[PDB]
Amino acid sequence: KLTSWKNELSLQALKADLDAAKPSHTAMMIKVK
């Protein structure tokens, strides 16, 4: 643990959020390209 919080995020939560949001962003970048 890096911090003293009762509930800590950990890396899996953040990467899960990233992979959940990624499919829409991948679709969007096609139009910009």
| Measured distance CA(33)–CA(25) in Å, rounded | 12
x-marked contacts with another protein along 1-33 as a string, rule CB under 8 A: -x---------x-xxxxxx-xxx--xxx-x---
Answer for the pair 13, 20: CB distance below 8 angstroms, yes or no: no
CB of 6 to another protein, least distance (A): 19
Nearer to another protein, 6 or 23 (CB): 23
Q: Which residues sit at the interface with another protein, rule CB under 8 A?
A: 2, 12, 14-19, 21-23, 26-28, 30
